[PDB]
């Protein structure tokens, strides 16, 4: 199934290693209920998005290095990177830095990732999600 | 939007920030 990253060095390497794809990280725990729902979505779309994105899972207990600076206080946090930069997206939720709930509609996440990919490749640090989750 | 959210640092920048804090401490 989906690859996991097991320490800070591996996370830095995953982000450093993509010149032309968005790095998608799910911070949480495989055992957490919200994560399970989100992981299933991520697994289901991974093949589909393979051309513009790669997805990793990070257990924030095994790998706590980022908990404070990325404010990983929600049970489930999905964040995006492109060429070693954190990419923000306006979801209309009041937090443009992360997707912090189990999105269960698979195609919505495909489209968000696509949006992040085009926007970031165009040099944007901030993109806007097609659907408004306010 | 006054006081707008800023992006987080790269994972490399965070690991570095963490390493610096241990140096000082």
Per the CB < 8 Å rule, is A79 touching B11?
no
Number of H helices and number of E strands within chain A? Answer: 3, 6
Cα A120 from chain centroid? Answer: 14
Q: Find the closest chain A residue to B7 by CA distance.
A: A86
Q: Say how far apart CA A83 and CA A99 lie, in whole Å.
A: 19
- Determination method here? X-ray
Give the tokens for residue A112. Answer: 């968000």
Cα B8 from chain centroid? Answer: 7
Give the tokens for residue A80. Answer: 């995006």
CATH of the domain at A52: 3.40.30.10
Q: Say how far apart CA A107 and CA A100 lie, in whole Å.
A: 17
Per the CB < 8 Å rule, is B18 touching A11?
no
Supply φ then ψ for residue A94, to 5 degrees: 90, 0
Neighbours of A57 (CB within 10 A): 21
- Which of A9, A25, A56, A66 should be substituted to probe chain B, the one whose Cβ sees the most B Cβ atoms within 10 Å? A66
PDB resolution in Å: 2.1
How many structural domains is chain A composed of?
Answer: 1
| A126-128 β-sheet, strand order | A4-5, A53-59, A22-28, A77-82, A85-90, A126-128
Give the tokens for residue A121. Answer: 């490749």
Instruction: Report whether A78 contacts A99 (CB < 8 A).
Output: yes
**Distance from B25 to chain A by nearest Cα, in Å?**
17
Residue A132 domain boundaries: 1-134
Chain B residues inside the 8 Å CB shell of A79: 8
Q: What would the DSSP string read from start to end of B1-25?
A: -TTPPPPPPPHHHHHHHHHHHHHH-
Q: Find the closest chain A residue to B17 by CA distance.
A: A69
**Max alpha carbon distance in chain B (Å)?**
37
Per the CB < 8 Å rule, is A70 touching B17?
no
Ramachandran assignment for A31, one of left (phi > 0), alpha (psi -120 to 50 degrees), beta (any other) = alpha
């Amino acid at each position: 199934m989906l690859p996991h990253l097991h320490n800070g060095w591996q996370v830095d390497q995953a982000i450093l290693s993509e010149e032309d794809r968005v790095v998608v990280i799910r911070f949480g725990h495989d055992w957490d209920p919200t994560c399970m729902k989100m992981d299933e979505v991520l697994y289901s779309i991974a093949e589909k998005v393979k051309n513009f994105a790669v997805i990793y899972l990070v257990d924030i207990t095994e790998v706590p290095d980022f908990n404070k600076m990325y404010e990983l206080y929600d049970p489930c946090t999905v964040m995006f990177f492109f060429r070693n930069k954190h990419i923000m997206i306006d979801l209309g939720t009041g937090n443009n830095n992360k997707i912090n709930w189990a999105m269960e509609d698979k195609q919505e996440m495909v489209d968000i990732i696509e949006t992040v990919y085009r926007g970031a490749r165009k040099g944007r640090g901030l993109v806007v999600s097609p659907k408004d989750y306010s | 939007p006054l006081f707008q959210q800023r992006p987080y640092p790269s994972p490399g920048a965070v690991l570095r920030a963490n390493a610096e804090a241990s140096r000082t401490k």
